[PDB]
Amino acid sequence: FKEYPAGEPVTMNEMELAAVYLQPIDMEPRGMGLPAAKADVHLEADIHAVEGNKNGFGAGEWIPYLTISYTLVNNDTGEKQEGTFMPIVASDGPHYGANIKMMGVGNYKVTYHIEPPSKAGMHRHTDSETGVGRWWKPFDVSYEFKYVGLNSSGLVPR
Amino acid sequence: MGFKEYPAGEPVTMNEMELAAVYLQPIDMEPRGMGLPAAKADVHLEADIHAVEGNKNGFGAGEWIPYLTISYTLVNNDTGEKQEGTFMPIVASDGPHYGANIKMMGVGNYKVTYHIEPPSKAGMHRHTDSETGVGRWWKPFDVSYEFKYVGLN
Ligand SMILES: [Cu+2]
Ligand SMILES: [Cu+2]
Ligand SMILES: [Cu+2]
């Protein structure tokens, strides 16, 4: 299952945030996201702390409890799609993502709208000895990538 | 130098996770509203849960297990009194954990049981493909810890 980068990684709020896509992936449970057979790609957000993180995460650690929605735009046509990622585990670890129905060939921009763990129920110590400070404000990161589809082998045509 | 934290019982390793229990002084948490404020509690009780080597649910050794749903049953064996509650996911300076501020039920020998439900209950999904997939979650299960509580300190 071949992975393709979407744009360039960005470092923001002491996290590294990358976007990747691959062929649609069957997931359990069912009912929240689009089924694989009804999608064109599986789109992911890879998000991990970097050194100096002030919210309690060590370098390289996954950031859990994020709420992440996406705005996908095919800039060739102007077509826009809104959706929301789920937290997902795979053999190479936890991430966020969704199966997506794409909008044809084009130069795309995808924006990930990211809310901090407080919005999904994660609390924080506030004592002087073990406390951490307030969360960063919800923020956006965007990726620009050229999309032509994936073929029956799950590969980008050459 | 020693951190003021009191182990509750002994760690156990089940379902390819190491599960430990500790308590400390009540801790004020944000956001406010959910759960007992520190002023109305006697201890802050924690669940310390990380994968061990060989975990098949996608977590590397030592990694925090996120998206668990954990409830507790606390019994003072000296008086018979029981309390049931839930833990919250929490981050502190040394990382994510689960816990709650607790009003205790007097000095005594206690048992605390953690009922643990897998990340699927709180919305975590899994790839099921041949290449990157992980299999079914384990079923909900109980772990318990016995400790002598005399107050702090
Ligand atoms: Cu995925
Ligand atoms: Cu936004
Ligand atoms: Cu805590």
PDB file of C-alpha atoms and ligand atoms in Angstrom:
ATOM      1  CA  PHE A   1       0.000   0.000   0.000  1.00  0.00           C
ATOM      2  CA  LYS A   2       1.954   2.937  -1.434  1.00  0.00           C
ATOM      3  CA  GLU A   3       1.800   6.334   0.333  1.00  0.00           C
ATOM      4  CA  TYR A   4       2.096   9.683  -1.451  1.00  0.00           C
ATOM      5  CA  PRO A   5       2.954  12.990   0.138  1.00  0.00           C
ATOM      6  CA  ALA A   6       0.489  15.872  -0.121  1.00  0.00           C
ATOM      7  CA  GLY A   7       2.548  19.050  -0.180  1.00  0.00           C
ATOM      8  CA  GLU A   8       5.149  19.880   2.429  1.00  0.00           C
ATOM      9  CA  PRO A   9       5.176  19.235   6.184  1.00  0.00           C
ATOM     10  CA  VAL A  10       4.659  22.237   8.438  1.00  0.00           C
ATOM     11  CA  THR A  11       5.890  22.848  11.988  1.00  0.00           C
ATOM     12  CA  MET A  12       3.400  24.788  14.131  1.00  0.00           C
ATOM     13  CA  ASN A  13       2.610  24.899  17.876  1.00  0.00           C
ATOM     14  CA  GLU A  14       5.557  22.556  18.623  1.00  0.00           C
ATOM     15  CA  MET A  15       4.151  19.825  16.358  1.00  0.00           C
ATOM     16  CA  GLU A  16       5.141  18.586  12.942  1.00  0.00           C
ATOM     17  CA  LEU A  17       2.064  18.179  10.733  1.00  0.00           C
ATOM     18  CA  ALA A  18       2.268  16.230   7.441  1.00  0.00           C
ATOM     19  CA  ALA A  19      -0.391  15.117   4.961  1.00  0.00           C
ATOM     20  CA  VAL A  20      -0.295  11.856   3.039  1.00  0.00           C
ATOM     21  CA  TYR A  21      -2.690   9.927   0.822  1.00  0.00           C
ATOM     22  CA  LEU A  22      -3.037   6.381  -0.417  1.00  0.00           C
ATOM     23  CA  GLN A  23      -5.651   4.063  -1.808  1.00  0.00           C
ATOM     24  CA  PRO A  24      -8.910   3.848   0.183  1.00  0.00           C
ATOM     25  CA  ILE A  25      -8.550   1.652   3.292  1.00  0.00           C
ATOM     26  CA  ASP A  26     -11.265  -0.451   4.888  1.00  0.00           C
ATOM     27  CA  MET A  27     -11.814   0.528   8.506  1.00  0.00           C
ATOM     28  CA  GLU A  28     -13.744  -0.641  11.492  1.00  0.00           C
ATOM     29  CA  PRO A  29     -16.105   0.168  13.023  1.00  0.00           C
ATOM     30  CA  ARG A  30     -18.436   1.127  10.195  1.00  0.00           C
ATOM     31  CA  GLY A  31     -20.868   4.025   9.982  1.00  0.00           C
ATOM     32  CA  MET A  32     -18.829   7.135  10.747  1.00  0.00           C
ATOM     33  CA  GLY A  33     -16.769   7.559   7.612  1.00  0.00           C
ATOM     34  CA  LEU A  34     -17.206   6.847   3.941  1.00  0.00           C
ATOM     35  CA  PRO A  35     -16.692   3.160   3.086  1.00  0.00           C
ATOM     36  CA  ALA A  36     -13.503   2.373   1.096  1.00  0.00           C
ATOM     37  CA  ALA A  37     -15.413   1.138  -1.954  1.00  0.00           C
ATOM     38  CA  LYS A  38     -17.206   4.503  -2.140  1.00  0.00           C
ATOM     39  CA  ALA A  39     -13.976   6.588  -1.925  1.00  0.00           C
ATOM     40  CA  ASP A  40     -11.017   7.559  -4.114  1.00  0.00           C
ATOM     41  CA  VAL A  41      -8.253   8.081  -1.545  1.00  0.00           C
ATOM     42  CA  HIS A  42      -7.457   7.587   2.104  1.00  0.00           C
ATOM     43  CA  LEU A  43      -6.190  10.970   3.319  1.00  0.00           C
ATOM     44  CA  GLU A  44      -4.219  11.284   6.531  1.00  0.00           C
ATOM     45  CA  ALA A  45      -2.828  13.810   8.943  1.00  0.00           C
ATOM     46  CA  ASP A  46       0.441  12.792  10.564  1.00  0.00           C
ATOM     47  CA  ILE A  47       0.901  14.916  13.651  1.00  0.00           C
ATOM     48  CA  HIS A  48       3.589  14.528  16.337  1.00  0.00           C
ATOM     49  CA  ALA A  49       5.232  16.726  18.930  1.00  0.00           C
ATOM     50  CA  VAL A  50       8.658  18.178  18.244  1.00  0.00           C
ATOM     51  CA  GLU A  51      11.281  19.194  20.825  1.00  0.00           C
ATOM     52  CA  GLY A  52      10.088  22.002  23.119  1.00  0.00           C
ATOM     53  CA  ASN A  53       6.449  21.014  23.231  1.00  0.00           C
ATOM     54  CA  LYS A  54       4.762  22.827  26.146  1.00  0.00           C
ATOM     55  CA  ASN A  55       1.592  20.755  26.290  1.00  0.00           C
ATOM     56  CA  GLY A  56       3.074  17.641  27.888  1.00  0.00           C
ATOM     57  CA  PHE A  57       4.244  15.637  24.884  1.00  0.00           C
ATOM     58  CA  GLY A  58       7.771  14.496  24.229  1.00  0.00           C
ATOM     59  CA  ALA A  59       9.464  14.730  20.844  1.00  0.00           C
ATOM     60  CA  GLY A  60       8.010  12.313  18.311  1.00  0.00           C
ATOM     61  CA  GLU A  61       4.928  11.472  20.381  1.00  0.00           C
ATOM     62  CA  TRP A  62       1.531  11.348  18.686  1.00  0.00           C
ATOM     63  CA  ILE A  63      -0.836  14.157  19.667  1.00  0.00           C
ATOM     64  CA  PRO A  64      -4.112  12.463  20.706  1.00  0.00           C
ATOM     65  CA  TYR A  65      -7.628  13.890  21.091  1.00  0.00           C
ATOM     66  CA  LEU A  66      -7.321  16.420  18.286  1.00  0.00           C
ATOM     67  CA  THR A  67     -10.452  17.401  16.409  1.00  0.00           C
ATOM     68  CA  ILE A  68      -9.554  17.746  12.737  1.00  0.00           C
ATOM     69  CA  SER A  69     -11.777  18.789   9.862  1.00  0.00           C
ATOM     70  CA  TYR A  70     -10.678  19.401   6.305  1.00  0.00           C
ATOM     71  CA  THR A  71     -11.556  21.777   3.487  1.00  0.00           C
ATOM     72  CA  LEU A  72     -10.512  20.240   0.170  1.00  0.00           C
ATOM     73  CA  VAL A  73     -10.424  22.431  -2.955  1.00  0.00           C
ATOM     74  CA  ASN A  74      -9.667  21.405  -6.533  1.00  0.00           C
ATOM     75  CA  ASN A  75      -8.199  24.749  -7.655  1.00  0.00           C
ATOM     76  CA  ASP A  76      -8.547  23.807 -11.344  1.00  0.00           C
ATOM     77  CA  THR A  77     -12.337  23.724 -11.026  1.00  0.00           C
ATOM     78  CA  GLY A  78     -12.899  25.648  -7.777  1.00  0.00           C
ATOM     79  CA  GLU A  79     -14.860  22.711  -6.333  1.00  0.00           C
ATOM     80  CA  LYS A  80     -14.805  22.573  -2.533  1.00  0.00           C
ATOM     81  CA  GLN A  81     -15.516  19.744  -0.092  1.00  0.00           C
ATOM     82  CA  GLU A  82     -15.844  19.760   3.696  1.00  0.00           C
ATOM     83  CA  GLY A  83     -15.402  16.738   5.905  1.00  0.00           C
ATOM     84  CA  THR A  84     -13.947  15.470   9.200  1.00  0.00           C
ATOM     85  CA  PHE A  85     -11.154  13.011  10.055  1.00  0.00           C
ATOM     86  CA  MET A  86     -11.329  10.236  12.639  1.00  0.00           C
ATOM     87  CA  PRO A  87      -8.616   8.978  14.986  1.00  0.00           C
ATOM     88  CA  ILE A  88      -7.263   5.731  13.519  1.00  0.00           C
ATOM     89  CA  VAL A  89      -4.766   3.027  14.432  1.00  0.00           C
ATOM     90  CA  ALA A  90      -2.780   1.060  11.908  1.00  0.00           C
ATOM     91  CA  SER A  91       0.207  -1.229  12.220  1.00  0.00           C
ATOM     92  CA  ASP A  92       2.614   1.736  12.111  1.00  0.00           C
ATOM     93  CA  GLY A  93       0.701   3.641  14.776  1.00  0.00           C
ATOM     94  CA  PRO A  94      -2.129   6.075  15.498  1.00  0.00           C
ATOM     95  CA  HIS A  95      -2.996   8.911  13.090  1.00  0.00           C
ATOM     96  CA  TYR A  96      -6.013  10.869  11.861  1.00  0.00           C
ATOM     97  CA  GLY A  97      -7.677  10.440   8.503  1.00  0.00           C
ATOM     98  CA  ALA A  98     -10.647   9.526   6.352  1.00  0.00           C
ATOM     99  CA  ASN A  99     -11.624   7.878   3.111  1.00  0.00           C
ATOM    100  CA  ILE A 100     -12.497  10.719   0.676  1.00  0.00           C
ATOM    101  CA  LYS A 101     -14.390  11.008  -2.567  1.00  0.00           C
ATOM    102  CA  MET A 102     -12.161  13.272  -4.672  1.00  0.00           C
ATOM    103  CA  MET A 103     -13.227  15.897  -7.231  1.00  0.00           C
ATOM    104  CA  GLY A 104     -11.363  14.920 -10.383  1.00  0.00           C
ATOM    105  CA  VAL A 105      -7.892  15.662 -11.659  1.00  0.00           C
ATOM    106  CA  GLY A 106      -6.404  18.950 -10.535  1.00  0.00           C
ATOM    107  CA  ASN A 107      -4.114  21.066  -8.417  1.00  0.00           C
ATOM    108  CA  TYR A 108      -5.569  20.769  -4.944  1.00  0.00           C
ATOM    109  CA  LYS A 109      -5.251  22.612  -1.678  1.00  0.00           C
ATOM    110  CA  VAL A 110      -6.340  20.848   1.492  1.00  0.00           C
ATOM    111  CA  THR A 111      -6.646  22.732   4.764  1.00  0.00           C
ATOM    112  CA  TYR A 112      -6.705  20.872   8.068  1.00  0.00           C
ATOM    113  CA  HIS A 113      -8.625  22.738  10.759  1.00  0.00           C
ATOM    114  CA  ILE A 114      -7.211  21.659  14.083  1.00  0.00           C
ATOM    115  CA  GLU A 115      -8.712  22.023  17.537  1.00  0.00           C
ATOM    116  CA  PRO A 116      -6.716  21.197  20.654  1.00  0.00           C
ATOM    117  CA  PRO A 117      -7.365  18.147  22.888  1.00  0.00           C
ATOM    118  CA  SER A 118      -9.469  20.204  25.309  1.00  0.00           C
ATOM    119  CA  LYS A 119     -12.326  20.213  22.776  1.00  0.00           C
ATOM    120  CA  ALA A 120     -12.510  16.406  22.763  1.00  0.00           C
ATOM    121  CA  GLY A 121     -12.489  16.029  26.548  1.00  0.00           C
ATOM    122  CA  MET A 122      -8.824  15.928  27.496  1.00  0.00           C
ATOM    123  CA  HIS A 123      -8.113  17.833  30.739  1.00  0.00           C
ATOM    124  CA  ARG A 124      -4.879  19.213  32.124  1.00  0.00           C
ATOM    125  CA  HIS A 125      -3.134  19.484  35.507  1.00  0.00           C
ATOM    126  CA  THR A 126      -2.717  23.107  36.547  1.00  0.00           C
ATOM    127  CA  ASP A 127      -0.593  22.667  39.738  1.00  0.00           C
ATOM    128  CA  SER A 128       2.908  24.221  39.784  1.00  0.00           C
ATOM    129  CA  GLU A 129       4.713  20.853  40.008  1.00  0.00           C
ATOM    130  CA  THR A 130       2.994  18.863  37.216  1.00  0.00           C
ATOM    131  CA  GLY A 131       0.786  21.404  35.440  1.00  0.00           C
ATOM    132  CA  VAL A 132       0.799  22.450  31.802  1.00  0.00           C
ATOM    133  CA  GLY A 133      -0.463  25.754  30.449  1.00  0.00           C
ATOM    134  CA  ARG A 134      -3.400  26.656  28.252  1.00  0.00           C
ATOM    135  CA  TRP A 135      -3.784  25.172  24.818  1.00  0.00           C
ATOM    136  CA  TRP A 136      -2.943  26.941  21.634  1.00  0.00           C
ATOM    137  CA  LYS A 137      -5.899  28.408  19.716  1.00  0.00           C
ATOM    138  CA  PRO A 138      -7.530  26.311  16.948  1.00  0.00           C
ATOM    139  CA  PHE A 139      -5.490  26.804  13.792  1.00  0.00           C
ATOM    140  CA  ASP A 140      -5.266  25.807  10.141  1.00  0.00           C
ATOM    141  CA  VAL A 141      -2.480  24.214   8.142  1.00  0.00           C
ATOM    142  CA  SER A 142      -2.659  23.747   4.359  1.00  0.00           C
ATOM    143  CA  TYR A 143      -1.051  21.516   1.723  1.00  0.00           C
ATOM    144  CA  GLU A 144      -0.888  21.919  -2.016  1.00  0.00           C
ATOM    145  CA  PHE A 145      -0.638  18.851  -4.212  1.00  0.00           C
ATOM    146  CA  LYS A 146      -1.243  17.695  -7.752  1.00  0.00           C
ATOM    147  CA  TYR A 147      -3.804  14.883  -7.976  1.00  0.00           C
ATOM    148  CA  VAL A 148      -4.478  12.660 -11.009  1.00  0.00           C
ATOM    149  CA  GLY A 149      -6.171   9.720  -9.316  1.00  0.00           C
ATOM    150  CA  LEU A 150      -5.008   6.319  -8.218  1.00  0.00           C
ATOM    151  CA  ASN A 151      -5.275   3.323 -10.480  1.00  0.00           C
ATOM    152  CA  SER A 152      -6.495  -0.215  -9.792  1.00  0.00           C
ATOM    153  CA  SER A 153      -3.098  -1.075  -8.183  1.00  0.00           C
ATOM    154  CA  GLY A 154      -3.464   1.870  -5.788  1.00  0.00           C
ATOM    155  CA  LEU A 155      -0.662   3.759  -7.532  1.00  0.00           C
ATOM    156  CA  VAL A 156      -0.409   7.232  -9.067  1.00  0.00           C
ATOM    157  CA  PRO A 157      -0.082   6.783 -12.880  1.00  0.00           C
ATOM    158  CA  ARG A 158       3.449   7.135 -14.342  1.00  0.00           C
TER     159      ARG A 158
ATOM    160  CA  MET B   1      13.523  15.481  45.394  1.00  0.00           C
ATOM    161  CA  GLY B   2      10.925  12.700  45.553  1.00  0.00           C
ATOM    162  CA  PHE B   3       7.618  13.328  43.785  1.00  0.00           C
ATOM    163  CA  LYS B   4       4.743  13.160  46.268  1.00  0.00           C
ATOM    164  CA  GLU B   5       2.973  10.182  44.668  1.00  0.00           C
ATOM    165  CA  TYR B   6       1.717   7.019  46.362  1.00  0.00           C
ATOM    166  CA  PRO B   7       1.614   3.734  44.434  1.00  0.00           C
ATOM    167  CA  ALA B   8      -1.640   1.833  44.689  1.00  0.00           C
ATOM    168  CA  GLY B   9      -0.920  -1.876  44.643  1.00  0.00           C
ATOM    169  CA  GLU B  10       1.326  -3.310  41.949  1.00  0.00           C
ATOM    170  CA  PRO B  11       1.421  -2.788  38.156  1.00  0.00           C
ATOM    171  CA  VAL B  12      -0.102  -5.608  36.104  1.00  0.00           C
ATOM    172  CA  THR B  13       0.483  -6.411  32.446  1.00  0.00           C
ATOM    173  CA  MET B  14      -2.602  -7.508  30.481  1.00  0.00           C
ATOM    174  CA  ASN B  15      -3.590  -7.258  26.786  1.00  0.00           C
ATOM    175  CA  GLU B  16      -0.023  -6.205  25.997  1.00  0.00           C
ATOM    176  CA  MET B  17      -0.302  -3.118  28.242  1.00  0.00           C
ATOM    177  CA  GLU B  18       1.262  -2.330  31.589  1.00  0.00           C
ATOM    178  CA  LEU B  19      -1.432  -0.919  33.863  1.00  0.00           C
ATOM    179  CA  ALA B  20      -0.498   0.832  37.096  1.00  0.00           C
ATOM    180  CA  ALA B  21      -2.320   2.939  39.680  1.00  0.00           C
ATOM    181  CA  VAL B  22      -1.006   5.862  41.718  1.00  0.00           C
ATOM    182  CA  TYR B  23      -2.518   8.671  43.747  1.00  0.00           C
ATOM    183  CA  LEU B  24      -1.378  12.064  44.904  1.00  0.00           C
ATOM    184  CA  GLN B  25      -2.743  15.271  46.390  1.00  0.00           C
ATOM    185  CA  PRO B  26      -5.904  16.632  44.688  1.00  0.00           C
ATOM    186  CA  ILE B  27      -5.040  18.629  41.548  1.00  0.00           C
ATOM    187  CA  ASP B  28      -7.061  21.455  40.020  1.00  0.00           C
ATOM    188  CA  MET B  29      -7.686  20.761  36.358  1.00  0.00           C
ATOM    189  CA  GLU B  30      -8.873  22.639  33.310  1.00  0.00           C
ATOM    190  CA  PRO B  31     -11.378  22.914  31.866  1.00  0.00           C
ATOM    191  CA  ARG B  32     -13.607  23.377  34.946  1.00  0.00           C
ATOM    192  CA  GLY B  33     -17.078  21.885  35.367  1.00  0.00           C
ATOM    193  CA  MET B  34     -16.450  18.178  34.872  1.00  0.00           C
ATOM    194  CA  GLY B  35     -15.628  16.251  38.020  1.00  0.00           C
ATOM    195  CA  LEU B  36     -14.751  17.104  41.582  1.00  0.00           C
ATOM    196  CA  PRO B  37     -12.751  20.279  42.175  1.00  0.00           C
ATOM    197  CA  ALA B  38      -9.538  19.783  44.150  1.00  0.00           C
ATOM    198  CA  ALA B  39     -10.955  21.535  47.238  1.00  0.00           C
ATOM    199  CA  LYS B  40     -13.715  18.914  47.479  1.00  0.00           C
ATOM    200  CA  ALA B  41     -11.421  15.896  47.063  1.00  0.00           C
ATOM    201  CA  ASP B  42      -8.900  13.955  49.154  1.00  0.00           C
ATOM    202  CA  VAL B  43      -6.696  12.445  46.442  1.00  0.00           C
ATOM    203  CA  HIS B  44      -6.051  12.551  42.733  1.00  0.00           C
ATOM    204  CA  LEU B  45      -6.192   8.958  41.437  1.00  0.00           C
ATOM    205  CA  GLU B  46      -4.407   7.955  38.203  1.00  0.00           C
ATOM    206  CA  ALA B  47      -4.281   5.089  35.743  1.00  0.00           C
ATOM    207  CA  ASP B  48      -0.862   4.690  34.150  1.00  0.00           C
ATOM    208  CA  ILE B  49      -1.347   2.613  30.951  1.00  0.00           C
ATOM    209  CA  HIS B  50       1.246   2.017  28.212  1.00  0.00           C
ATOM    210  CA  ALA B  51       1.892  -0.608  25.583  1.00  0.00           C
ATOM    211  CA  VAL B  52       4.534  -3.252  26.143  1.00  0.00           C
ATOM    212  CA  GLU B  53       6.629  -4.879  23.449  1.00  0.00           C
ATOM    213  CA  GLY B  54       4.464  -7.237  21.405  1.00  0.00           C
ATOM    214  CA  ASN B  55       1.358  -5.033  21.364  1.00  0.00           C
ATOM    215  CA  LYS B  56      -0.714  -5.906  18.297  1.00  0.00           C
ATOM    216  CA  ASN B  57      -3.060  -2.925  18.364  1.00  0.00           C
ATOM    217  CA  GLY B  58      -0.578  -0.534  16.696  1.00  0.00           C
ATOM    218  CA  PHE B  59       1.282   0.846  19.709  1.00  0.00           C
ATOM    219  CA  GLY B  60       5.030   0.635  20.250  1.00  0.00           C
ATOM    220  CA  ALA B  61       6.589  -0.325  23.588  1.00  0.00           C
ATOM    221  CA  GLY B  62       6.051   2.369  26.186  1.00  0.00           C
ATOM    222  CA  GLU B  63       3.500   4.301  24.126  1.00  0.00           C
ATOM    223  CA  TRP B  64       0.482   5.739  25.909  1.00  0.00           C
ATOM    224  CA  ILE B  65      -2.780   3.967  25.073  1.00  0.00           C
ATOM    225  CA  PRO B  66      -5.196   6.754  24.076  1.00  0.00           C
ATOM    226  CA  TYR B  67      -8.999   6.803  23.765  1.00  0.00           C
ATOM    227  CA  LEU B  68      -9.649   4.338  26.605  1.00  0.00           C
ATOM    228  CA  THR B  69     -12.865   4.507  28.577  1.00  0.00           C
ATOM    229  CA  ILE B  70     -12.091   3.827  32.228  1.00  0.00           C
ATOM    230  CA  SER B  71     -14.452   3.601  35.144  1.00  0.00           C
ATOM    231  CA  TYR B  72     -13.507   2.695  38.691  1.00  0.00           C
ATOM    232  CA  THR B  73     -14.967   0.941  41.716  1.00  0.00           C
ATOM    233  CA  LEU B  74     -13.338   1.940  44.975  1.00  0.00           C
ATOM    234  CA  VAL B  75     -14.103   0.012  48.199  1.00  0.00           C
ATOM    235  CA  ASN B  76     -12.904   0.713  51.715  1.00  0.00           C
ATOM    236  CA  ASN B  77     -12.560  -2.880  52.954  1.00  0.00           C
ATOM    237  CA  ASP B  78     -12.502  -1.641  56.599  1.00  0.00           C
ATOM    238  CA  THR B  79     -16.002  -0.095  56.386  1.00  0.00           C
ATOM    239  CA  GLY B  80     -17.624  -1.789  53.419  1.00  0.00           C
ATOM    240  CA  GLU B  81     -18.260   1.514  51.659  1.00  0.00           C
ATOM    241  CA  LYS B  82     -18.158   1.609  47.849  1.00  0.00           C
ATOM    242  CA  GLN B  83     -17.804   4.477  45.342  1.00  0.00           C
ATOM    243  CA  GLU B  84     -18.083   4.317  41.551  1.00  0.00           C
ATOM    244  CA  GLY B  85     -16.903   6.900  39.088  1.00  0.00           C
ATOM    245  CA  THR B  86     -15.170   7.564  35.828  1.00  0.00           C
ATOM    246  CA  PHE B  87     -11.731   8.786  34.840  1.00  0.00           C
ATOM    247  CA  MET B  88     -10.899  11.492  32.297  1.00  0.00           C
ATOM    248  CA  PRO B  89      -8.002  11.719  29.821  1.00  0.00           C
ATOM    249  CA  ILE B  90      -5.541  14.241  31.291  1.00  0.00           C
ATOM    250  CA  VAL B  91      -2.200  15.736  30.334  1.00  0.00           C
ATOM    251  CA  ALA B  92       0.472  16.702  32.832  1.00  0.00           C
ATOM    252  CA  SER B  93       4.086  17.819  32.446  1.00  0.00           C
ATOM    253  CA  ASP B  94       5.256  14.223  32.194  1.00  0.00           C
ATOM    254  CA  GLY B  95       2.592  13.209  29.691  1.00  0.00           C
ATOM    255  CA  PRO B  96      -0.929  11.948  29.097  1.00  0.00           C
ATOM    256  CA  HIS B  97      -2.723   9.692  31.575  1.00  0.00           C
ATOM    257  CA  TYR B  98      -6.208   9.011  32.913  1.00  0.00           C
ATOM    258  CA  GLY B  99      -7.520  10.052  36.308  1.00  0.00           C
ATOM    259  CA  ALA B 100      -9.879  11.940  38.576  1.00  0.00           C
ATOM    260  CA  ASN B 101     -10.000  13.817  41.847  1.00  0.00           C
ATOM    261  CA  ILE B 102     -11.640  11.516  44.437  1.00  0.00           C
ATOM    262  CA  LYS B 103     -13.330  12.068  47.779  1.00  0.00           C
ATOM    263  CA  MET B 104     -12.052   9.151  49.890  1.00  0.00           C
ATOM    264  CA  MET B 105     -14.129   7.115  52.379  1.00  0.00           C
ATOM    265  CA  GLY B 106     -11.920   7.350  55.446  1.00  0.00           C
ATOM    266  CA  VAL B 107      -8.706   5.619  56.385  1.00  0.00           C
ATOM    267  CA  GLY B 108      -8.552   1.925  55.649  1.00  0.00           C
ATOM    268  CA  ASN B 109      -7.445  -0.924  53.430  1.00  0.00           C
ATOM    269  CA  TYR B 110      -8.883  -0.266  49.969  1.00  0.00           C
ATOM    270  CA  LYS B 111      -9.423  -2.128  46.741  1.00  0.00           C
ATOM    271  CA  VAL B 112      -9.762  -0.201  43.499  1.00  0.00           C
ATOM    272  CA  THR B 113     -10.872  -1.861  40.295  1.00  0.00           C
ATOM    273  CA  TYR B 114     -10.436  -0.235  36.907  1.00  0.00           C
ATOM    274  CA  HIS B 115     -12.874  -1.298  34.231  1.00  0.00           C
ATOM    275  CA  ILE B 116     -11.208  -0.673  30.899  1.00  0.00           C
ATOM    276  CA  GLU B 117     -12.953  -0.436  27.529  1.00  0.00           C
ATOM    277  CA  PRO B 118     -10.941  -0.349  24.275  1.00  0.00           C
ATOM    278  CA  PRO B 119     -10.399   2.750  22.090  1.00  0.00           C
ATOM    279  CA  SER B 120     -13.216   1.728  19.690  1.00  0.00           C
ATOM    280  CA  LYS B 121     -15.744   2.842  22.342  1.00  0.00           C
ATOM    281  CA  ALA B 122     -14.461   6.438  22.304  1.00  0.00           C
ATOM    282  CA  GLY B 123     -14.352   6.582  18.500  1.00  0.00           C
ATOM    283  CA  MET B 124     -10.953   5.296  17.442  1.00  0.00           C
ATOM    284  CA  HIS B 125     -11.037   3.404  14.129  1.00  0.00           C
ATOM    285  CA  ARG B 126      -8.594   0.857  12.696  1.00  0.00           C
ATOM    286  CA  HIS B 127      -7.259  -0.021   9.268  1.00  0.00           C
ATOM    287  CA  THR B 128      -8.219  -3.599   8.388  1.00  0.00           C
ATOM    288  CA  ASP B 129      -6.272  -4.034   5.111  1.00  0.00           C
ATOM    289  CA  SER B 130      -3.685  -6.790   4.618  1.00  0.00           C
ATOM    290  CA  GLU B 131      -0.719  -4.408   4.679  1.00  0.00           C
ATOM    291  CA  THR B 132      -1.316  -1.837   7.422  1.00  0.00           C
ATOM    292  CA  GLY B 133      -4.237  -3.358   9.336  1.00  0.00           C
ATOM    293  CA  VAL B 134      -4.644  -4.238  12.986  1.00  0.00           C
ATOM    294  CA  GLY B 135      -7.065  -6.834  14.275  1.00  0.00           C
ATOM    295  CA  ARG B 136     -10.022  -6.775  16.665  1.00  0.00           C
ATOM    296  CA  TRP B 137      -9.732  -5.010  19.969  1.00  0.00           C
ATOM    297  CA  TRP B 138      -9.613  -6.943  23.146  1.00  0.00           C
ATOM    298  CA  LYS B 139     -12.849  -7.046  25.159  1.00  0.00           C
ATOM    299  CA  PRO B 140     -13.491  -4.809  28.197  1.00  0.00           C
ATOM    300  CA  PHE B 141     -11.700  -6.110  31.287  1.00  0.00           C
ATOM    301  CA  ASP B 142     -11.010  -5.445  34.962  1.00  0.00           C
ATOM    302  CA  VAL B 143      -7.730  -4.878  36.764  1.00  0.00           C
ATOM    303  CA  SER B 144      -7.458  -4.200  40.479  1.00  0.00           C
ATOM    304  CA  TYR B 145      -5.128  -2.771  43.091  1.00  0.00           C
ATOM    305  CA  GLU B 146      -5.041  -3.081  46.880  1.00  0.00           C
ATOM    306  CA  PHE B 147      -3.601  -0.288  48.996  1.00  0.00           C
ATOM    307  CA  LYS B 148      -3.517   1.019  52.554  1.00  0.00           C
ATOM    308  CA  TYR B 149      -4.819   4.590  52.729  1.00  0.00           C
ATOM    309  CA  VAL B 150      -3.881   6.693  55.759  1.00  0.00           C
ATOM    310  CA  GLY B 151      -4.414  10.187  54.291  1.00  0.00           C
ATOM    311  CA  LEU B 152      -1.712  12.509  52.950  1.00  0.00           C
ATOM    312  CA  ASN B 153       0.858  12.100  54.164  1.00  0.00           C
TER     313      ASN B 153
HETATM  314 CU    CU C   1      -5.500   5.900   7.990  1.00  0.00          CU
HETATM  315 CU    CU C   2     -10.111  26.317  10.591  1.00  0.00          CU
HETATM  316 CU    CU C   3      -3.802  13.330  36.806  1.00  0.00          CU
END
